[PDB]
A and B are shown apart, each in its own frame.
Chain A
Amino acid sequence: MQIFVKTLTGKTITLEVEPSDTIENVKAKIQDKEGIPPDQQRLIFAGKQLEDGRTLSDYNIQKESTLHLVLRLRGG
């Protein structure tokens, strides 16, 4: 299924995922496309933080959903 991933900066990354995908699995896809390590990636949905050790079925993520990927920079 298709999804939309808008970063905190306002970037809109288009990716593909399955209803049986995991948070970590998505992070890898994003990492491949962009390059940002999964450890620096954070998945927020409607303000709710999607924990890495969770599935898309936990927060009931549907298709054509808009996920917000926050980039926690360790630098300054």
Chain B
Amino acid sequence: GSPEFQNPEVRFQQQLEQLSAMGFLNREANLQALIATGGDINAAIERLLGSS
């Protein structure tokens, strides 16, 4: 239906599929990194692995 992406239970659902496919055990932080970028997964992971 129409769930909230902010909810850690969802974790974007689709965006998390790419994050986990690139070898990343983090979940919550990834949801934030995805918001900070706005869909830019590569730019997210780059900074995400460094800090937040």
Contacts and interface: CB of A to CB of B under 8 A. Distances in A.
Contacts of B25: 46-48
Interface stretch (A15-23, A53-61, A67-75): A67-75
B23 A9 contact: no
Interface residues of A, number: 16
A66 B49 contact: no
Interface residues of B, number: 10
Nearest to A76: B43
B37 interface: no
Interface of A: 6, 8-9, 42, 44-49, 66, 68, 70-73
Given A47-B49, A48-B25, A70-B45, 12 more contacts: A6-B22, A8-B22, A8-B45, A44-B23, A44-B24, A45-B23, A46-B23, A46-B25, A49-B50, A70-B46, A71-B46, A72-B46
